[PDB]
Design a protein around this ligand. Structure first.
Ligand SMILES: *[C@@H]1O[C@H](CO)[C@@H](O)[C@H](O)[C@H]1NC(C)=O
Lengths: 49, 107
């Protein structure tokens, strides 16, 4: 679990744009207001190789 | 004596700080914290080191590289930008990798 990738973003990266932000992502009807829930998800995932 | 560039400029995201220490240009990218109006009183993910007058600069960011051009001259007119022509020449082309939306100038 040392290896991770971003699952969703507000917009696609420009060439060689780098994004280390941890902010919770609105994945549907729920406005996030700085906390997780249904339709509001953590932006990274881990491979579990 | 310096400039700051970034999206939030401070706090929750990375930003680019340029400062002249009166001996070197000092440059860093970090999750910087600062006041609403900082002064140069007497994670470092990128770090680097290197009226009578008019100093001119151009700043642009493309494909994660940040370009700086400049020119310096004495001037005759005391008020503002004299009506005339000369061209700015490149200083640096820094591989900073961030996006930018805001900037601020440091006295
Ligand atoms: C900066 O350091 C913190 C821990 O102090 C870490 O959580 C964060 O991911 C780092 N961010 C960058 C841009 O290196």
């Amino acid at each position: 679990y040392n290896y991770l990738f971003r699952l969703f973003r507000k917009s696609n990266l420009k060439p060689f744009e780098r994004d280390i932000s941890t902010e919770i992502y609105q994945a549907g009807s729920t406005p996030c207001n700085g906390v997780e829930g249904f339709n509001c998800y953590f932006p990274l995932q881990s491979y579990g190789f | 004596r310096g400039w700051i560039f970034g999206t939030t400029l401070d706090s929750k995201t990375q930003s680019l700080l340029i400062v002249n220490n009166a001996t070197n240009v000092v440059i860093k990218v970090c999750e910087f914290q600062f006041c609403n109006d900082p002064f140069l009183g007497v994670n470092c993910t990128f770090e680097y080191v290197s009226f009578k007058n008019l100093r001119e600069f151009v700043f642009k960011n493309i494909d994660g590289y940040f370009k700086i051009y400049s020119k310096h001259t004495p001037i005759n007119l005391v008020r503002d930008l004299p009506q005339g022509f000369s061209a700015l020449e490149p200083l640096v082309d820094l591989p900073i990798g961030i996006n930018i939306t805001r900037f601020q100038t440091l006295l």
